[PDB]
Amino acid sequence: MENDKGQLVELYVPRKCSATNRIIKADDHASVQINVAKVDEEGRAIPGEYVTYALSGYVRSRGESDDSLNRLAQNDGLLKNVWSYS
């Protein structure tokens, strides 16, 4: 939300669920932001350097947070043969 003269007049810009694109509200206290560590060669895992996902309360509530990670992880190469489309 810009005005005429550019300039973001938004108070802030919400995050969005990685599984569903639903806005994660200020009060959604069952929302969660997982950080997976980016492993280097040797497999040490670096300070900082995260593969950040975020999941809404809604998805967790339904018991779909697991299957949503497996998909989102396997698409970013963190798994290899877990999730399936069929």
Partner: protein, 204 residues
Amino acid sequence: PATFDLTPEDAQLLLAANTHLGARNVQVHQEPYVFNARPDGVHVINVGKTWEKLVLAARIIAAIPNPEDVVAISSRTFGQRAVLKFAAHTGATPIAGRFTPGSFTNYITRSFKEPRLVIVTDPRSDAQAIKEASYVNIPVIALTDLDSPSEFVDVAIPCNNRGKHSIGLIWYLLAREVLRLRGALVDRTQPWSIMPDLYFYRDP
């Protein structure tokens, strides 16, 4: 990488512990982690997936900046020793036995943790931790079976939680991988001095 996969020596420990065995007629639909049902009613947990989930879980734990902000819950008898060992090795603060409602909520309580990650041995029996986690933006790991409830669990390690060895073994391996990540063990495949049998329950 290609090195962080199932070594055959680890697959012996899974198949020895009977962590590949699963729940029988009961079988939750939120579980494609299943090879096949045997001649008997039991289902065979796909231990390839079990490993991949474990490493994934390890990397999440590994990402946590202050190790004490992880917490490792067990109310179950069979998981009580395992969480205490994991705490010692991995630097997490555990909760054996009674969880205490108002742990994560309620700042007045004496047992007032403020974690950044939770692990749980059975989500059915440790349901109060999982439930309380959802009130305060805390992620969750779980050593689920194929009949276990899946609500407010983010990453689930499929495994037997009937057996005594299975629980401790999955707890052992998890503690191992969070150590291999970070400069502790510096492996290149080194079986590790501490046995799996350390983690298992005592039985007086």
